[PDB]
Amino acid sequence: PFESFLPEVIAPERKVPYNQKLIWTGVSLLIFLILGQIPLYGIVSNRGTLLELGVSPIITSSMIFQFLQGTQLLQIRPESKQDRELFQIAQKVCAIILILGQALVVVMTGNYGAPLPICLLLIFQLMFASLIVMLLDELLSKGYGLGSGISLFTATNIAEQIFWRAFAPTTVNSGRGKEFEGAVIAFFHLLAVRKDKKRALVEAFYRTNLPNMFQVLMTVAIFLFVLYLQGFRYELPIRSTKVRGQIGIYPIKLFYTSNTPIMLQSALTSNIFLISQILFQKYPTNPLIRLIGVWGIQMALSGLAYYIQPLMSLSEALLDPIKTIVYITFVLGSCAVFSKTWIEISGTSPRDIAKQFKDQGMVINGKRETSIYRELKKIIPTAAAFGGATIGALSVGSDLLGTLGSGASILMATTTIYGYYEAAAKEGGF
Amino acid sequence: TLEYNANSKLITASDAVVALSTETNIDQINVLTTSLIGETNPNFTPQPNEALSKMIKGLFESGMKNLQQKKLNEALKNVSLAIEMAQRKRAPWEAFAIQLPELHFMLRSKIDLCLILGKHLEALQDLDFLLGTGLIQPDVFVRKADCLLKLRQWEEARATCERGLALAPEDMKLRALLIETARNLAEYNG
Amino acid sequence: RVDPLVVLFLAVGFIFSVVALHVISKVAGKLF
Amino acid sequence: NDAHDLYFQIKEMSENEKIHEKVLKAALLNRGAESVRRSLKLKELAPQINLLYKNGSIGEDYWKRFETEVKLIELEFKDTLQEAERLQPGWVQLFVMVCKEICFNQALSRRYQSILKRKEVCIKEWELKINNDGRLVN
Amino acid sequence: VEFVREGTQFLAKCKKPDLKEYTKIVKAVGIGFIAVGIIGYAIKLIHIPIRYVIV
Amino acid sequence: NYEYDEASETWPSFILTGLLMVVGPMTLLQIYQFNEEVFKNLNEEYTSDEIKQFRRKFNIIIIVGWILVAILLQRINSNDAQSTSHGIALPRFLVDGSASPLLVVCYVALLGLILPYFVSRWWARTQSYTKKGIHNVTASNFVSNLVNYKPSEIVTTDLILHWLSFAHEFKQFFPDLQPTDFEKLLQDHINRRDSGKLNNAKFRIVAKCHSLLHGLLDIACGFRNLDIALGAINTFKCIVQAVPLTPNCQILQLPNVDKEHFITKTGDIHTLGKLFTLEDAKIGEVLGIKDQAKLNETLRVASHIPNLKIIKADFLVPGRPYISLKVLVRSAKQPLIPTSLIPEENLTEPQDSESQRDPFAMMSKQPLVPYSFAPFFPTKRRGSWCCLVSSQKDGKILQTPIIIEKLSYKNLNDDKDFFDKRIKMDLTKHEKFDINDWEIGTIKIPLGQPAPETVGDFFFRVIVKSTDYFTTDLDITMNMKVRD
CATH class of the missing domain: 1.25.40 (Serine Threonine Protein Phosphatase 5, Tetratricopeptide repeat)
Known part of the structure; x- marks a missing residue:
């Protein structure tokens, strides 16, 4: 514990209405977006612009402190209103120094150049950018904004990528002529200027080299399917005991884990792929290194990393059915067990909910009081496992049909926006 | 401005127009200082007066006696005079729990008499x-x-x-x- | 300690300062 | 809207006009009375003001203004009590009770004096025609 | 195979959404998503010629 | 580095797509695209001309998009037209022509001035205004006037007018006038007087007084004070109808009556029923108008103002207790029907899960109220109903007043005029009397407080005051018998 006087935005003494919340979300998003396109000065993807660091250091700070909380080394006690402020100020004081260290690393090692005032200005620019991003996250989180800042930024990046891969203006000219990188642009151009409709439709429909219209239809289909499969929930009747006459319902949604296990799975597969590639690069051939994977053209061959490789189209799907029959079950079981582990660790176990019912005095309508945990054991784990398996299935389908973006990203964006709408509708507003 | 009298020792407002708040506070200070001139003891106590209560009770009984004589016109005047005296000639710092119930009780008989009389x-x-x-x-x-x-x-x-x-x-x-x-x-x- | 308009004004001042720095460098390299 | 400055004005007048000593004590007691009345009023009105403020229909600056007034009243009362102690030695253990009584007593006195004016509003608003002796002649 | 049976019995007890609610869900989510996307796309388009002119 | 289009060969297609993806859905959506109110016609026939002058005083995108699409299509079809080479679809002169710094200056302006200026203006405008819909200086003045308010002075109409002339939203409209002028204006409006030159200011302040009076009523109910709330409602009636508050005002709110005759000749008529007890020609003989074509008009106005009446009222104990009332909106003409003839089917409530979840939903379905008859309020008003509850042990208000809007005025229709009071022939035993026709409104108010934990009797008193006419209202003392 220590004393510190740091910059922080204050929370409103009253509840802020809906319209001001929406306007603040919009303006904060606009500022964060403009900040990321303007490049630095002294030098001679969001790489090389004012947003070099991004929010990743903030994610690392939050992650390491969440892990320190979970491992029970800080002795968290919600009974005091001082340890919360201490943890919150520790967040900021460690984030600032870690961000400073990352900035020093990237300026003394990055491709900006070894040769002093220029280096000072370069470190100051990044410092100020990261500081403003931190203040903006804090502002959006204190209550002025609909929800978190990080999830909003991630949904922004996903939606922007999905659009740019559809309505791109950048023309690619390789011998044959000017070709568009957008989908609808390409369709309208080849419909208007080519004047050979029967050939133009098929030429603008497949485009094995650049995005096309079939991909757009497929991603709209998967979006609508995800939006349909989101409202699923298990509802059971609950009644109170402290004050009588209060009857309620406790909804148990299907996507219980809320996109975490798919993120963990993607992260671990990416990490193991990088490690396998680096070790195959260091040692050309060895018994274990050749058995785990033989890299080729980069995709491994006759290796385990090759077996865990995703399927891009139906061609490779029908090519080797054994790879599919192992990979699908592998990813599904992984997401399922990750869902179970996450609901076990995140304090969302049926025991904790039964205890919360004991505190609040809530009880089932037509059931006794000694069997709440027994009934929750029959509802929560199956729901979590099935949600994980369904997320895995939808991810496999998206990666197979090859839409404009990976299924995980669309799922994350749709889930975040759905949470925003759910809060807005439960509160009640325009 | 406001002039300080010479012999009466009551503060008088000399200005042309004044609001009601200042007038009320000036009258309250007048009655306070007029009571302080009368009460000679330096360390006054909230203990009520005696002769004042005596004359009040005397007037009240003299008024109530008129009902037995069936005089319904002067009894109201007598009770009104008793109430006016008990409202005027009792300094404010006297006990609350003995100035309130006496007023309430006398006003009760006044209410009954006035209701029967015709006002x-x-x-x-x-x-x-x-x-x-x-x-x-x-x-x-x-x-x-x-x-x-x-x-x-x-x-x-x-x-x-x-x-x-x-x-x-x-x-x-x-x-x-x-x-x-x-x-x-x-x-x-x- | 700080109000939202403070954050907005700081961010806008910063962005405009960087853009002014770029345009000053460019006009200086072009003129002299 | 107070008689606070009135004691100061009378003090400055007595500094050269040779005003008797009892008028000063009377003005002092009256200022204390107003102070006690305001303290009680704020102590009793705090909850509804807080409720309206949390309901979000009174603004924000008024809550701070109210909070400032809460302690400003106490500061004024303490200054008045110190002035009283300076005016007469060993005269504080009795002053608080004398003030606690004059406050309520003159409040009742004003409430009773108000009826002579309050009476004619009823006549004007109900269009009565009252002859002498307070009887009705329609 | 019992896991699939448990899952099917669980979805049988789920609450399938109706059409009149589905339309509100899809309207809200689609409007939000398209708004975020269009904002991102426009801010990524405007800044190309300006980053050419300045730099 | 990109290669911008130099010969105008690719930006036509891009702009054409940008136009189509906006025009298409708009064209598609454009292609895809109860309660009798009989005062809406008679209101505009008696309102003075100056008010009409006041009230009068204070798609092409699809076509232009389609014609621009036609121009672009003609222009594109009229044109004659290894390593990869990128190219951006925007034309060349935008960056290479003589207009290079104009774009950067326009953008620097749009980032440096227009954004912070507008956001700051909007923030300052939505920070000050209170949630009820009034300024902060007005709310501060109202609270500072209720705090040091001696309970000695009886609340009158003059006192509330003097509180309202101290508002702040009247200063912005006319930064050159003073509060006493506002008071004189409001008095000249109430007593049906002419201002002479400030009429277009008096109409502004009188049309604004509505939300101010609602704010004052809400704050007065907040402080648990009843007199000022009741006075606020009476003064609201007084302004909306433009008639001074007197004993016999219910009969002076009528359209065309002369005071200097009515006050002098008759002195026993004080309300509507006492009027309709008279015959048809005697009404005109007493009111002194002597014009049949206009006497029918004033009778048509005086036969439609809603007087309430209770049928059944009791407590109910869901998770949160709420009061339920059974009012029977009647006109000033129909005689008394006994409560016994009610078939008891209308009163009872359906017991369903959807109904038990949100009980006020069944009330929220009823139609709306007609346009009021306010020939002197500058704007047009829907009748309103303000129902506030008060305790009976000490006499203080214990919740904010609930302002209901929906009530079924169907019982006033001119079709059932056979049920008159002047016939006195026991008209309930008539061929036209069908008890299945009289619709019984329903009003539900949450108690706003948790039930007392003790066991005994607890008294309450619910008032339902009208806010646009001078009609009859509700004053009942209901009791809850907590029994556990």
């Missing part, structure tokens, strides 16, 4: 003061509703009768007054 608006106003000071009993609501129906205000009559019956539901005259005001108001509308 009505004065009786109703005294009753509203007595009920505003913090005495809520069916010995007040019935008389107030009677005065209201006497000087012809029907809606407030029903309101007061219902407020009364909702504080002593077993009463016998409040229900009669409720029925009478109901008939009067049904005539007033229909």
Whole structure:
């Protein structure tokens, strides 16, 4: 514990209405977006612009402190209103120094150049950018904004990528002529200027080299399917005991884990792929290194990393059915067990909910009081496992049909926006 | 500005126009200093006076005796003079719990006498003061509703009768007054 | 300690300062 | 809207006009009375003001203004009590009770004096025609 | 195979959304998503010629 | 580095797509695209001309998009037209022509001035205004006037007018006038007087007084004070109808009556029923108008103002207790029907899960109220109903007043005029009397407070005051018998 006087935005003494919340979300998003396109000065993807660091250091700070909380080394006690402020100020004081260290690393090692005032200005620019991003996250989180800042930024990046891969203006000219990188642009151009409709439709429909219209239809289909499969929930009747006459319902949604296990799975597969590639690069051939994977053209061959490789189209799907029959079950079981582990660790176990019912005095309508945990054991784990398996299935389908973006990203964006709408509708507003 | 008198030792306001707040505070300071001139002891105590209460009781008894003589005109004057004396010639720092109940009790007999005599608006106003000071009993609501129906205000009559019956539901005259005001108001509308 | 308009004003001042720095460098390289 | 500055004005007048000693004590007691009345009023009105403020229908600056007034009243009362102690030695253990009584007593006095004016509003608003002796002549 | 049976029995007890609610869900989510996307796309388009002119 | 289009060969297609993806859905959506109110016609026939002058005083995108699409299509079809080479679809002169710094200056402006200026203006405008819909200086003045308010002074109409002339939203409209002028204006409006030159200011302040009076009523109910709330409602009636508050005002709110005759000749008529007890020609003989074509008009106005009446009222104890009332909106003409003839089917409530979840939903379905008859309020008003509850042990308000809007005025229709009071022939035993026709409104108010934990009798008193006419209202003392 220590004393510190740091910059922080204050929370409103009253509840802020809906319209001001929406306007603040919009303006904060606009500022964060403009900040990321303007490049630095002294030098001679969001790489090389004012947003070099991004929010990743903030994610690392939050992650390491969440892990320190979970491992029970800080002795968290919600009974005091001082340890919360201490943890919150520790967040900021460690984030600032870690961000400073990352900035020093990237300026003394990055491709900006070894040769002093220029280096000072370069470190100051990044410092100020990261500081403003931190203040903006804090502002959006204190209550002025609909929800978190990080999830909003991630949904922004996903939606922007999905659009740019559809309505791109950048023309690619390789011998044959000017070709568009957008989908609808390409369709309208080849419909208007080519004047050979029967050939133009098929030429603008497949485009094995650049995005096309079939991909757009497929991603709209998967979006609508995800939006349909989101409202699923298990509802059971609950009644109170402290004050009588209060009857309620406790909804148990299907996507219980809320996109975490798919993120963990993607992260671990990416990490193991990088490690396998680096070790195959260091040692050309060895018994274990050749058995785990033989890299080729980069995709491994006759290796385990090759077996865990995703399927891009139906061609490779029908090519080797054994790879599919192992990979699908592998990813599904992984997401399922990750869902179970996450609901076990995140304090969302049926025991904790039964205890919360004991505190609040809530009880089932037509059931006794000694069997709440027994009934929750029959509802929560199956729901979590099935949600994980369904997320895995939808991810496999998206990666197979090859839409404009990976299924995980669309799922994350749709889930975040759905949470925003759910809060807005439960509160009640325009 | 404001002039300080010479022999009377009461502060007088000499300005042309003044608000009500300053006038009230000036009068209160006048009565305070006029009491301090009279009371000679340096360390005064909230203990009430004696001769003042004696003359007050004397006037009250002399007024009440007129009822036995069936003199209904001068008894009201006598009780009014007693109330005015007990309101004027008693310094403010005297005990509250002995200046309040005496006033309430004397005003009660004054209310009854004034209601029987034939004066009505004065009786109703005294009753509203007595009920505003913090005495809520069916010995007040019935008389107030009677005065209201006497000087012809029907809606407030029903309101007061219902407020009364909702504080002593077993009463016998409040229900009669409720029925009478109901008939009067049904005539007033229909 | 700080109000939202403070954060907005700081961010806008910063962005405009960087853009002014770029345009000053460019006009200086072009003129002299 | 106060008699606070009135004691100061009378003090400055007495500094050269040779005003008797009892008028100063009377003005002092009256200022204390107003102070006690305001303290009680704020102590009793705090909850509803807080409720309206949390309901979000009174603004924000008024809550701070109210909070400032809460302690400003106490500061004024303490200054008045110190002035009283300076005016007479060993005269504080009795002053608080004398003030606690004059406050309520003169409050009742004003409430009773108000009826002579309150009476004619009823006549004007109900269009009565009252002859002498307070009887009705319709 | 019992896991699939448990899952099917669980979805049988789920609450399938109706059409009149589905339309509100899809409207809200689609409007939000398209708004975020269009904002991102426009801010990524405007800044190309300006980053050419300045730099 | 990109290669911008130099010969105008690719930006036509891009702009054409940008136009189509906006025009298409708009064209598609454009292609895809109860309660009798009989005062809406008679209101505009008696309102003075100056008010009409006041009230009068204070798609092409699809076509232009389609014609621009036609121009672009003609222009594109009229044109004659290894390593990869990128190219951006925007034309060349935008960056290479003589207009290079104009774009950067326009953008620097749009980032440096227009954004912070507008956001700051909007923030300052939505920070000050209170949630009820009034300024902060007005709310501060109202609270500072209720705090140091001696309970000695009886609340009158003059006192509330003097409180309202101290508002702040009247200063912005006319920064050159003073509060006493506002008071004189409001008085000249109430007493049906002419201002002479400040009429277009008096109409502004009188049309604004509505939300101010609602704010004052809400704050007065907040402080648990009843007199000022009741006075606020009476003064609201007084302004909306433009008539001074007197004993016999219900009969002076009528369209065309002469005071200097009515006050002098008759002195026993004080309300509507006492009027309709008279015959048809005697009404005109007493009111002194002597014009049949206009006497029918004033009778048509005086036969439609809603007088309430109770049928059944009791407590109910869901998870949160709420009061339920059974009012029977009647005109000033129909006689008394006994409560016994009610078939008891209308009163009872359906017991369903959807109904038990949100009980006020069944009330929220009823139709709306007609346009009021306010020939002197500058704007047009829907009738309103303000129902506030008060305790009976000490006499203080214990919740904010609930302002209901929906009530079924169907019982006033001119079709059932056979049910008159002047016939006195026991008209309930008539061939036209069908008890299945009289619709019984429903009003539900949450108690706003948790039930008392003790065991005994607890008294309450619910008032339902009208806010646009001088009609009859509700004053009942209901009791809850907590029994556990």
